[PDB]
PDB file of C-alpha atoms in Angstrom:
ATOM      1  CA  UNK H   1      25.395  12.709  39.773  1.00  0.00           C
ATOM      2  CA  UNK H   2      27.439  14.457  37.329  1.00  0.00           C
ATOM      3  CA  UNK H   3      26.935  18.152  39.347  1.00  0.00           C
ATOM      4  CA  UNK H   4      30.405  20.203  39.729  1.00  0.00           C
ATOM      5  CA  UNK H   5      28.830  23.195  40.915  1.00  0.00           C
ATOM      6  CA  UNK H   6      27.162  23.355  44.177  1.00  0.00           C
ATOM      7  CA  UNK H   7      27.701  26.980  45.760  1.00  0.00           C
ATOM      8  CA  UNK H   8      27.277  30.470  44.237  1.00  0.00           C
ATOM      9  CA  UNK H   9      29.865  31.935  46.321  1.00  0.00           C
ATOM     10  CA  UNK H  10      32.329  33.248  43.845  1.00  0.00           C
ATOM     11  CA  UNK H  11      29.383  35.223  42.712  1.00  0.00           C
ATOM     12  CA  UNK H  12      27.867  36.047  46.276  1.00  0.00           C
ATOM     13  CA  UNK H  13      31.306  38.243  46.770  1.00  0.00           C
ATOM     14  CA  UNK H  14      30.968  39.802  43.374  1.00  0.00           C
ATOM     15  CA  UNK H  15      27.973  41.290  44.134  1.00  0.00           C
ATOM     16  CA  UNK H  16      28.967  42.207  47.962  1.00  0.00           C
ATOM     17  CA  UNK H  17      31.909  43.947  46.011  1.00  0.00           C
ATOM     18  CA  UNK H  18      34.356  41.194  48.175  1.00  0.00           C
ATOM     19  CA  UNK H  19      37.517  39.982  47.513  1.00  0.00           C
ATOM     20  CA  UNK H  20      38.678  36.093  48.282  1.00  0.00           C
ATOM     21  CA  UNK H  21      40.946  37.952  50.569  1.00  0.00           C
ATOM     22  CA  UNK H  22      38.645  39.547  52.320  1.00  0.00           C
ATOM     23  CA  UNK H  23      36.585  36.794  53.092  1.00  0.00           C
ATOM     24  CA  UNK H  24      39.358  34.738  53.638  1.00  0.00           C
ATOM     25  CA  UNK H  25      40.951  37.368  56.562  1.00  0.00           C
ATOM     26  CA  UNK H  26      37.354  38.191  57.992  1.00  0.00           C
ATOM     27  CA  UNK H  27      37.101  33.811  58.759  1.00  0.00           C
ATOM     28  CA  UNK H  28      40.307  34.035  59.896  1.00  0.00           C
ATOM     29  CA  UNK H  29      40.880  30.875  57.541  1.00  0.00           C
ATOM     30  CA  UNK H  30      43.886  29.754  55.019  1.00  0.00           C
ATOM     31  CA  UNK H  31      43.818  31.504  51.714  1.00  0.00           C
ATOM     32  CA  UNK H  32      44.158  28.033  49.913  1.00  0.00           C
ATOM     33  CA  UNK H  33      40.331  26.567  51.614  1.00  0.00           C
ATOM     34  CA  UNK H  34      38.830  29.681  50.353  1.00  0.00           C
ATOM     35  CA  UNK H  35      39.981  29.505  46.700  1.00  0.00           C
ATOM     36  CA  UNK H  36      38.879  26.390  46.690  1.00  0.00           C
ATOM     37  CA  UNK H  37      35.066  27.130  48.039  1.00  0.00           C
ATOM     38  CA  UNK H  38      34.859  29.577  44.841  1.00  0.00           C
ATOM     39  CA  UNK H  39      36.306  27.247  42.307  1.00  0.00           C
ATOM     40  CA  UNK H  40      33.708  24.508  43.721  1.00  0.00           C
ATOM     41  CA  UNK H  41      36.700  22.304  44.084  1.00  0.00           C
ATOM     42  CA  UNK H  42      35.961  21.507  47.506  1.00  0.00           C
ATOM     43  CA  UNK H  43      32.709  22.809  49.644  1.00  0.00           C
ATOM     44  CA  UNK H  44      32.343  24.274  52.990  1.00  0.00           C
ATOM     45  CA  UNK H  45      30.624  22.837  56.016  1.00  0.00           C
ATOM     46  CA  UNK H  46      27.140  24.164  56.620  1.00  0.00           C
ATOM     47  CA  UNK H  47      28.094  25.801  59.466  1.00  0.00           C
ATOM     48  CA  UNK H  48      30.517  27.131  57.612  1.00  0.00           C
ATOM     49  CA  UNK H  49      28.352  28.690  54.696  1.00  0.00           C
ATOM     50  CA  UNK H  50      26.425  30.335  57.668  1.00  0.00           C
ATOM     51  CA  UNK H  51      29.415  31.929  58.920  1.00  0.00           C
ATOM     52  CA  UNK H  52      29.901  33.111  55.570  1.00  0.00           C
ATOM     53  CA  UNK H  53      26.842  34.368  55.048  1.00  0.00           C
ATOM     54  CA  UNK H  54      26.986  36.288  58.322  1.00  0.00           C
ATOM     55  CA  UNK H  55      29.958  37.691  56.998  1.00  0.00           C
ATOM     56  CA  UNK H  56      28.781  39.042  53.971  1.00  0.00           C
ATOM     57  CA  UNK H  57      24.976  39.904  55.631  1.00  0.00           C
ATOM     58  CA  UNK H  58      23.085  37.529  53.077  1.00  0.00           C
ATOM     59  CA  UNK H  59      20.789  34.978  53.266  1.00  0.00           C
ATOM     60  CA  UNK H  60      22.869  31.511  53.832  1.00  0.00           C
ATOM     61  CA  UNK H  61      20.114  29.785  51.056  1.00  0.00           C
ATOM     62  CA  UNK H  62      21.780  32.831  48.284  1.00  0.00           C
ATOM     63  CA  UNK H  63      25.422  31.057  48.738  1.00  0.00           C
ATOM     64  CA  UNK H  64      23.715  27.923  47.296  1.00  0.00           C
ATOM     65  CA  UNK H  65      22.734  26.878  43.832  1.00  0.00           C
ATOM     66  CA  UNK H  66      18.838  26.612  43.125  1.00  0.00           C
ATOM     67  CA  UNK H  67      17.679  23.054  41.983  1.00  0.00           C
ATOM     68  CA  UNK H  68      14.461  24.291  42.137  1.00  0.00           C
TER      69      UNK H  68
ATOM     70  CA  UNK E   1      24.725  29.859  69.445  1.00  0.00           C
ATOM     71  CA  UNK E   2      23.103  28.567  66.407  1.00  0.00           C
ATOM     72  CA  UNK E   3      21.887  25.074  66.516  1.00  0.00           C
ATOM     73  CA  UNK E   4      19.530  24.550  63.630  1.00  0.00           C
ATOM     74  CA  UNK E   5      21.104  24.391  60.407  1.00  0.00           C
ATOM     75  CA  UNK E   6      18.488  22.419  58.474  1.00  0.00           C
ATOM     76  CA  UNK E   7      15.069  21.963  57.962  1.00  0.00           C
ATOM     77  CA  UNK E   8      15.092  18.176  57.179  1.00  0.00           C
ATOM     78  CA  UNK E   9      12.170  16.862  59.210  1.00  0.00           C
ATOM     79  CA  UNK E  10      10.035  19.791  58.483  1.00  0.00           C
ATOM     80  CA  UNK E  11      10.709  19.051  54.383  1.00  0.00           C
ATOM     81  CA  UNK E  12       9.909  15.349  55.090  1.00  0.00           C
ATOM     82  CA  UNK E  13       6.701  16.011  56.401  1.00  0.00           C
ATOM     83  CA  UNK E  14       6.031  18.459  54.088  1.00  0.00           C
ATOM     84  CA  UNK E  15       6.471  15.107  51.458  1.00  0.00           C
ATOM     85  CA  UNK E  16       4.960  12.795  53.225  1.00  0.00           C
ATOM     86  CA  UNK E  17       8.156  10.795  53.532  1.00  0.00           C
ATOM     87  CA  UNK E  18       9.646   9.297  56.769  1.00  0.00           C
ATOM     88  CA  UNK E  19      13.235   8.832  58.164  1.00  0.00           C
ATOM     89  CA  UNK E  20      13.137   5.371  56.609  1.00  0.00           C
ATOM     90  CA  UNK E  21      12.338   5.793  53.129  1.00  0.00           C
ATOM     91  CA  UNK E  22      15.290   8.500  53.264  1.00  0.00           C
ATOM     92  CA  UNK E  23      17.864   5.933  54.188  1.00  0.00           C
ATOM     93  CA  UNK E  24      16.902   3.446  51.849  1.00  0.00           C
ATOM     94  CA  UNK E  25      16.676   5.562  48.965  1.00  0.00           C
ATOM     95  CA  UNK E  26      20.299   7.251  49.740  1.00  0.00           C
ATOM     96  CA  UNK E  27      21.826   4.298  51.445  1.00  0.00           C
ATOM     97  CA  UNK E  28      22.379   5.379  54.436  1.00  0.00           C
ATOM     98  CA  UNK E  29      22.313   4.057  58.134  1.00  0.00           C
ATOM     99  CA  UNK E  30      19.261   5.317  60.041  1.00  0.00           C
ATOM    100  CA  UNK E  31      21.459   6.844  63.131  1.00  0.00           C
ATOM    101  CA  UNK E  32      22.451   9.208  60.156  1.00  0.00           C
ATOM    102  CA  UNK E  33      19.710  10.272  59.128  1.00  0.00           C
ATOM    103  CA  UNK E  34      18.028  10.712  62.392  1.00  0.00           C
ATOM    104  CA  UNK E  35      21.196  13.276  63.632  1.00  0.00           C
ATOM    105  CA  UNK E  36      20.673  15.350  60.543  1.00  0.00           C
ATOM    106  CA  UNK E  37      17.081  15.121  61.246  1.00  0.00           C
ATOM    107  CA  UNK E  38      17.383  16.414  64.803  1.00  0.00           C
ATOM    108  CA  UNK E  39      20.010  18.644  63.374  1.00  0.00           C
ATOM    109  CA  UNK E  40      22.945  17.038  66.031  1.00  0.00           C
ATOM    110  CA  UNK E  41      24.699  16.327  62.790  1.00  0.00           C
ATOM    111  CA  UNK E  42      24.817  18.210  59.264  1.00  0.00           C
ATOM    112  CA  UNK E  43      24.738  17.004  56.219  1.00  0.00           C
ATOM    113  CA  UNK E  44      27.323  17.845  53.609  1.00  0.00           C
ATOM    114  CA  UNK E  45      26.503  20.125  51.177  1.00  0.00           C
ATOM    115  CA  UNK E  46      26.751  17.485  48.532  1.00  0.00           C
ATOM    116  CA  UNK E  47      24.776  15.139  50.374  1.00  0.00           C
ATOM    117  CA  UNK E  48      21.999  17.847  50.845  1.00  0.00           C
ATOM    118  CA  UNK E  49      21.817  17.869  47.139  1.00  0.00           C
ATOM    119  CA  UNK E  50      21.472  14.265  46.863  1.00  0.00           C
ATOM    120  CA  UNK E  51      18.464  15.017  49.900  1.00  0.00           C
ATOM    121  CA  UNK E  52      16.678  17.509  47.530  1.00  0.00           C
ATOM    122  CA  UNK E  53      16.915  15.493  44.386  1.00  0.00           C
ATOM    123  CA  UNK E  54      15.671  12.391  46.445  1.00  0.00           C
ATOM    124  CA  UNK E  55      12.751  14.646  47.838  1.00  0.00           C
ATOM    125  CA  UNK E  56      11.977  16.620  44.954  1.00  0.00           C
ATOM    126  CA  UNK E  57      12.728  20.035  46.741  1.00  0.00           C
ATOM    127  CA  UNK E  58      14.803  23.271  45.594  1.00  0.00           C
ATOM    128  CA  UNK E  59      18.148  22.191  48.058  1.00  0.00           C
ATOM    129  CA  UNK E  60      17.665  25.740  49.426  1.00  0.00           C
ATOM    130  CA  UNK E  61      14.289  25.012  51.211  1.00  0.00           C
ATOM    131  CA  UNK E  62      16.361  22.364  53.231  1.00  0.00           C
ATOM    132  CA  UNK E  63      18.193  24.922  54.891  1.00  0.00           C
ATOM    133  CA  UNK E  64      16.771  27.449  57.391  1.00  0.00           C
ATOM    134  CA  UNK E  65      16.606  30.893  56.115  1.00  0.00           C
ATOM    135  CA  UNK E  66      18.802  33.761  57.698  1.00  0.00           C
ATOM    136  CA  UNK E  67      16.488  36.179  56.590  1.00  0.00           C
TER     137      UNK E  67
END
């Protein structure tokens, strides 16, 4: 596969009106892993995007790109 | 205390496909498979992808919903 982009997350916060830095306090995680979840440099667990999705009170299957 | 991530089994039934036919067409060792399958194990979001492409299936429908 050629795919780069696997999560929507970047755009998730956008619309919860979220900052990397608020996400990245609220998971108590490093600033650095978070950046790189929105840049789709490097992807989070699955237990992690439901943590995340918790977080931001979405549906987990929203922080994920359709293939449909 | 969640313990079910992903629907995996339930979207190979769905397809008509079995535990087998998923590890040959990804290359991958059965014991794999089966732990994602009984959700012991998850899958890596990129390897989901590869899942969904192999099945056919919007990647989203191989996770369980959270609402």
């Amino acid at each position: 596969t050629e795919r780069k982009i696997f999560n929507r997350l970047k755009s998730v916060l956008a619309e919860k009106g979220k900052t990397n830095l608020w996400l990245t306090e609220t998971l108590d995680k490093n600033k650095t892993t978070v950046s790189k979840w929105c840049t789709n440099d490097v992807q989070p667990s699955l237990e992690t995007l439901f943590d995340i999705a918790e977080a931001l009170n979405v549906d987990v299957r929203e922080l994920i790109v359709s293939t449909k």
